[PDB]
Symmetry: D2
Subunit: 87 residues, 4 copies
């Protein structure tokens, strides 16, 4: 359905307590808003909103619409970002 | 622990497909960012980030919170506090 | 005209080099986005967009407004309105 | 000095009433936040803050940049606009 993706949810540098949701092996180090959006589009998810504030440290959020629930979508996104990085 | 809260997650005007997470009876109608921040503060959750963009005003936003509880339980507690504020 | 207001433009805590536009005596300490919005509404300026980001540590943002005056005059009027708001609040109760 | 750049200030698609500061021929069509940042960096300005919000009505964009420049804002906006025009000509392969 529709949900928010917060980059920390996919960040392998973080504990679950600090925001990571995906298993650390699936997660990637310091995922960027730009990478998440790129993956979402490759995965044919609809991008509803992308907000980014850079102060440079980046703070951001993405709202997505997907054929699947958030958990599954986050994994597909993390895997896609890993692909991007392996090339 | 730490997690994001997107207002649509506790919006009773939305189906689960369109973003709602909490049970529709606990959900509240059109929760505002300010309402969520106020509830979090009353619940002694730590507010880490609050972003809001308002256009023409239609609002878009997110809150990052630190809670002793997981997101599901925290969203429910927040919804209840918002209901309480509104009732006054 | 339509123009952006950046809160630092009227912040007396800041030097001109760091972004303050209005004279220091008219500027106010740490103007909040919400106060600028309230001032604009009392001044009958139309608010087109309000963006704010608050980070735990604090506040960043911008307001797009329409005003019958140029930006420089409008900033001064907003600063003076906020000064009035804060004073009215202080004397209350 | 430090100041804000609001992309509409240099957007040739807009009238002055809707926010455009610089002359229309210097302004460029729909300058993107990222283009302004790229221009500022090329011009040796220092970028302090960049905010952008993109909403699906591809996406409608809203944003602002805080910059530091040796020049006043009016001249900096013109320099930025003309630099973006140059980048775009390069991307188009038209000099
Ligand atoms: Br774990
Ligand atoms: Br989380
Ligand atoms: Br993006
Ligand atoms: Br949204
Ligand atoms: Br964040
Ligand atoms: Br699923
Ligand atoms: Br996987
Ligand atoms: Br989260
Ligand atoms: Br954060
Ligand atoms: Br939103
Ligand atoms: Br929970
Ligand atoms: Br629960
Ligand atoms: Br409760
Ligand atoms: Br402006
Ligand atoms: Br303007
Ligand atoms: Br406001
Ligand atoms: Br706008
Ligand atoms: Br700022
Ligand atoms: Br005037
Ligand atoms: Br524009
Ligand atoms: Br505009
Ligand atoms: Br004009
Ligand atoms: Br005009
Ligand atoms: Br012209
Ligand atoms: Br022209
Ligand atoms: Br032009
Ligand atoms: Br152009
Ligand atoms: Br164009
Ligand atoms: Br950028
Ligand atoms: Br050089
Ligand atoms: Br800033
Ligand atoms: Br804007
Ligand atoms: Br400089
Ligand atoms: Br100059
Ligand atoms: Br100017
Ligand atoms: Br151009
Ligand atoms: Br061309
Ligand atoms: Br040519």
């Amino acid at each position: 359905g529709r949900f928010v993706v917060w980059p920390s949810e996919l960040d392998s540098r973080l504990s679950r307590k600090y925001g990571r949701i995906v298993p650390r092996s699936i997660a990637v180090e310091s995922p960027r808003v730009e990478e998440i959006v790129r993956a979402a589009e490759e995965l044919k998810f609809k991008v509803i909103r992308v907000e980014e504030d850079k102060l440079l440290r980046t703070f951001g959020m993405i709202v997505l619409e997907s054929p699947y629930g958030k958990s599954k979508s986050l994994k597909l996104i993390a895997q896609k970002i890993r692909e991007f990085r392996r090339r």
